[PDB]
Design an enzyme around this catalytic site. Structure first.
Site, PDB file in Angstrom:
ATOM      1  N   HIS B 305      35.921 -11.521   6.557  1.00 55.97           N
ATOM      2  CA  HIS B 305      35.984 -12.362   7.751  1.00 55.97           C
ATOM      3  C   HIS B 305      36.561 -13.737   7.415  1.00 55.97           C
ATOM      4  CE1 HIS B 305      33.936 -13.099  11.900  1.00 55.97           C
ATOM      5  NE2 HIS B 305      35.122 -13.675  11.822  1.00 55.97           N
ATOM      6  N   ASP B 362      30.213  -6.139  12.325  1.00 62.87           N
ATOM      7  CA  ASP B 362      30.807  -4.981  12.995  1.00 62.87           C
ATOM      8  C   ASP B 362      30.783  -3.716  12.148  1.00 62.87           C
ATOM      9  OD1 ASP B 362      31.237  -6.516  15.223  1.00 62.87           O
ATOM     10  OD2 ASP B 362      33.278  -7.068  14.648  1.00 62.87           O
TER      11      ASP B 362
END
Lengths: 426, 426, 106
Positions: B305, B362
């Protein structure tokens, strides 16, 4: 060119920043390095911040100058045609005959919209605003055209562009037809871009429709004069959504909604009614209807402009075109004396003189469209339709740049970390 | 004020600029008035520009910090629920039992979607991707709910925010049902937000559906963990589209297309293909998708990320919940224990340790969804559904600052004025 | 040539299929439904019945096949034209659109 050499900044340490220059317009200070250094500026609205380099359109507002690929808007308005202006906007050069021939065949090739997309229109209310339907349909094309959504693929952008470019007019005329209860009209290859639009807007199966070359050329000019207008609210929306990966269709759909934003703004919305209604040559003339102006909503009614200081360059060709059309449509213009009167009040009343509520391009665009029996609800639809090529150009240039998903910062001014203990027991 | 006291912009005469400080985070330099002095910065990408001031969400990437109105995400995801969190993001404080019950009441009484809109659903192709239908429906809302589009009227803005918060789950579920050919399910006033969504997703007329408590909690947590994420690409689109005055529904539609964005490329689903297309340890990894991944093929499966440095603070509780879910279902997970190997790989593979490709929220969210029987073509629809309250809070804040008109500048590097001489005909 | 058109309600049947369905499955579907619209020529023991049924299938099959194609690609259906040949008419119903007159290459 001088100080363009360089310059520096410092609060606790020294930093040297370059001074870039444009081929027109003022210099800019490249701060593309301050970030790493750990320095960040604060500019809510990006009014003192340059977000991109562009080669599409140049505007010098104070001087009333508008150029598309270097070409003055006045020359394109009278010497070119919408389709050719489209080519120039997307390619950067006037097309050779062969190049233009192919561009036109490709466009003409895909004007029809898939019959299932056409089925979508019938799910809206007949009373819905045609602009809301226009945004709805455009924001749904992705579900039907899922094969040209990867904005990272050059062939994709290419296809997506021609799809939006060729179908927007078909779509806009369908919104109109659906709003009045008449059957949709298919695109005809034998007509011009402008002639074809008028055909799809006005013909019915009860008799062959014949386009008046005067009105056609008028529409062509309305279109060229709204093809693109540099950076602004809707184009900035198209650029932002675009750099975030969003598919082309969704990007244009957001552009349309941004363009419509001011209209349903309330103070503008209220003043819109007053103009389109009050007009019995007793109100508008004796400054009766204009005696009420708390809500300005001027540029919306076609008065004044945010960028151009003294006049809208696009308004020159449009006023002469307005004069032409009003005469071609002969004597069927009575109530449309408020047109002549309002221009007089905009140029002779001190208020308008002081605050500069001079008639802009849309003042005359509105007069033309109205004289043609086109309702006001369709005004923004047609402007969005025309502006779509400019959006595609900017969108295509944002991609070609460097695909740098823009991530602006925030100055946090909220609560510092605090523990949470609910006061509810569900 | 550490390495930033006061700064001086040097060109030819020292220009002092005021430094601003947040309650948390980095100090910034003020430059709002610079343009008013012909001095503009250049910063495509917005690497050093702070577009706004906000009090909603705070993130400290390197510290793995995420707060909502000051409350730590871990705390909220553990001792709260989605509605209460929506109240917090929207109101800035945790609710009283009375404020909460009032809020809860208003929400549940706006959950049903207009009958005519259901007709629009049926006009989309049965093979439409759920996210595409979601974009198409949300963008079409302004056509119907046309009594709440005045963005400057505080009344319209709350009615719109409530409509979106209430209807998104309803629309999201219907997107699913339509894709599999099962009848749409109406909201259940007696069920919780997450329980109502699960019932609308999987219930059928054939028999009563029983909402598993552990699954009801798992889903509510997924919603909590995706409620908002500060100034990201999709939030930027919402704020920018909103600045022009675009209606509430168009802005949310733009945020959904923006969230969908980085998932349209071929290698996007091509990668997120085998991630599920195969359900067996020694097959997807085992000397396979090691290099079989081509463009992103990592960051799309839930690894790494750009915001967080070492780990995703949201994944903490999400991983905990993942256990409870696989544990609980057992016979609806155990076969899928190919996750543990994927996670193990990400924890020890020199390539993953290299790219800092740690499993994010996620990765764990996807596992719970693959476990509840939700298709991967519904994942981002659910994330978008949860993020809407966040998008609504940001849009509103921007409107509290007085509709910050996001209109950046350009550096023109195109042709200087040049005469237009057409080579064509046609 | 007298009976190439298919009753407009039968035409309504096509729109109930998925746009992604195989045109062959649609072709079988529509043909297997004609009986609900043409219940007056079902008695195979009646010579006049067979006679009628034959011309009905013979004249309408091409109209039907071209509709399957048009529906599969999203273009509007094209009506049969008496002034064309059996083959020319099929090509016309398969390829023409309202955007320009279609000309069949002999």
């Amino acid at each position: 060119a001088d100080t363009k050499a360089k310059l520096t900044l410092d609060g606790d340490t020294a930093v040297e920043l370059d001074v870039l220059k444009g081929t027109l317009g003022q210099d800019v200070i490249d701060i593309r390095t301050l970030g790493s250094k750990g320095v960040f500026t604060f500019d809510p609205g990006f009014t003192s911040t340059t977000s991109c380099e562009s080669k599409i359109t140049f505007i010098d507002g104070d001087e009333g100058i508008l150029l598309h690929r270097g070409f003055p808007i006045d020359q394109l308005a009278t010497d070119s045609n919408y389709l050719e202006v489209c080519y120039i906007l997307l390619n950067g050069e006037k097309p050779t005959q062969e190049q233009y021939d192919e561009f036109k065949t490709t466009v003409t090739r895909h004007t029809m919209i898939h019959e299932q997309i056409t089925r979508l229109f019938h799910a809206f209310r007949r009373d819905s605003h045609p602009m809301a339907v226009m945004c709805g349909i455009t924001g749904a094309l992705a579900a039907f055209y899922h094969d040209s959504l990867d904005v990272n693929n050059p062939r994709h952008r290419e296809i997506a562009a021609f799809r939006l470019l060729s179908k927007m007019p078909t779509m806009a005329a369908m919104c109109y037809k659906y709003s009045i209860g008449q059957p949709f009209v298919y695109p005809r290859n034998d007509l011009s871009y402008a002639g074809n639009f008028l055909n799809m807007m006005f013909s019915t199966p009860c008799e062959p429709y014949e386009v008046n070359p005067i009105l056609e050329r008028a529409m062509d000019r309305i279109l060229i004069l709204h093809a693109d207008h540099e950076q602004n609210a809707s184009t900035s929306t198209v650029r932002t959504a675009g750099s975030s990966g969003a598919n082309p269709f969704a990007c244009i759909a957001a552009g349309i909604a941004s363009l419509w934003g001011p209209a349903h703004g309330g103070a503008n919305e209220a003043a819109l009614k007053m103009l389109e209604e009050i007009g019995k040559k007793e109100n508008i003339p004796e400054f009766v209807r204009r005696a009420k102006d708390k809500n300005d909503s001027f540029r919306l009614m076609g008065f004044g402009h945010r960028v151009y200081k003294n006049y809208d360059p696009r308004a020159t060709v449009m006023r002469e075109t307005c004069h032409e059309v009003l005469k071609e449509l002969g004597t069927k213009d009575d109530l449309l004396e408020v047109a002549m009167e309002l221009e007089n009040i905009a140029l002779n009343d001190p208020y308008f003189i002081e605050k500069k509520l001079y008639p802009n391009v849309d003042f005359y665009s509105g007069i033309i469209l109205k004289a043609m029996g086109i309702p006001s609800s369709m005004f923004t639809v047609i402007f969005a339709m025309a502006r779509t090529v400019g959006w595609i150009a900017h969108w295509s240039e944002m991609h070609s740049d460097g695909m740098k998903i823009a991530r602006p910062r925030q100055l946090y001014t909220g609560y510092e970390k605090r523990d949470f203990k609910s006061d509810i027991k569900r």
